[model samples]
Target: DVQLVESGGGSVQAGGSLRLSCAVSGSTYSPCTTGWVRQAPGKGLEWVSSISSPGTIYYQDSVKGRFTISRDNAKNTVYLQMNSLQREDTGMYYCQIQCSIREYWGQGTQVTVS
Candidate 1:
């Protein structure tokens, strides 16, 4: 079975920062690519970042400067860090395998900024 779970969200003041976590589990954890996608309140989904099994990471131009994606292969976990949070950042973020449009998805996490 394949599994991807994400958990991280809470209220943060504007200009504050937050870290998110995505745990990977299945028959194995290698040879896979994963990324984060988020939908701001009342907005459409946006790609945040992605990481390869080799640990290479890519970020969307909109958040390239403030978002970071990394993984701990040994623990089968991925992480996302974003700084300078703002009101527009409030949204539900999800973890998903780069492929399979609907196969794996984390229960969306709602983040709030004030």
Candidate 2:
């Protein structure tokens, strides 16, 4: 049960910065990569980005610099960061660990940047 859970799930203002914790546990694979995704207040999803264990990455085309993913690989935990937050960033965020797209662990986190 590679459980993934998030810390924050609520609303914020246009200029506010929201903090979230996306944690994972009980897995055969340790030190898995962490990824962040988003969805409009009630709309579809956007793959924000992902971060590698040794600090490499794959950022999405829509959310290039405003989003970030970090992990405590040793403890099997991860997080997402959104800086200089904008109104367009308003959405539900997620913390996910991919065993594969068809087989992954995920914790849903809702957030509103505006």
Candidate 3:
């Protein structure tokens, strides 16, 4: 049973920065694609970014400038960093790992921007 545990989320003021991390457990961390998604309060899910095993990355236009995605194969961890955060960035951020036909998601990290 593969699992993803995310951390590094908490309260922040507007215009601040934050970094969220997802650690993989119960399975190998490489050879799979990782993605980040977020849902604003009472809003639908929004794709933040995704990074392939080979290092290719894609970011949603809305977060292009201030958001970045990266991974450390040796540590079995994926990270998402956001700069110049705003109140609208408050939400539940989730990390997803996709391998073949299976996809696993993290419990989600709650971010609050005041």
Candidate 4:
């Protein structure tokens, strides 16, 4: 089974920036697409961004300009960076790996912006 280890999220002041990472193990990154999704307190999940196996990237309109998704295939890691943070950015962020047959998710990282 694929394993994802998540880290790098924590409390931040409004207007600051954060970088969250998910390190992949038990498989290489070349054959998978990875993404980030976040949920605000009491709210549903929202797509943040994703990077394809070939390196193509996509972002949701809500996070455009402030959020970036990137991958380091050599390290089998995917990263999400958010800038100009606000209270609305407070939430649990998850990293997902999508393959042909199934999806795997991280344990979720809590991000609090004050």
Q: How well is each residue in 32-61 modelled by candidate 1, as lDDT tens digits?
A: 777889998778999889987666888888
lDDT of each: 0.81, 0.69, 0.91, 0.91
Q: List residue ranges in candidate 2 displaced over 4 A.
A: 100-102
lDDT of 3 by residue, 13-96 (tens): 899999999999886544889999899999999889999978899999888889988899878899999898989899999999
Q: Return the clash pairs for model 3, or none.
A: none
Q: Candidate 3 has what TM-score?
A: 0.94
Query: Clash pairs of candidate 4?
Result: none
Error of 2 at 72 (Å): 1.0
Per-residue error (Å), model 3, residue 50: 0.6
State the weakest 10-residue window (summed lDDT) of model 4.
Answer: 24-33
Off by over 4 Å in 3: 28-30
Backbone clashes, each candidate: 0, 0, 0, 0
- Worst ten-residue run, lDDT, model 2? 98-107
Encode model 2's per-residue lDDT on 1-114: one tens digit a residue: 667777766777676666677766675454455678777766897778888656788888766676666677666777666676777877777766655342464657766765
Greater-lDDT candidate between 2 and 3 = 3
lDDT of 2 at 36: 80
Candidate 2: how many backbone clashes? 0
lDDT of 1 at 36: 89
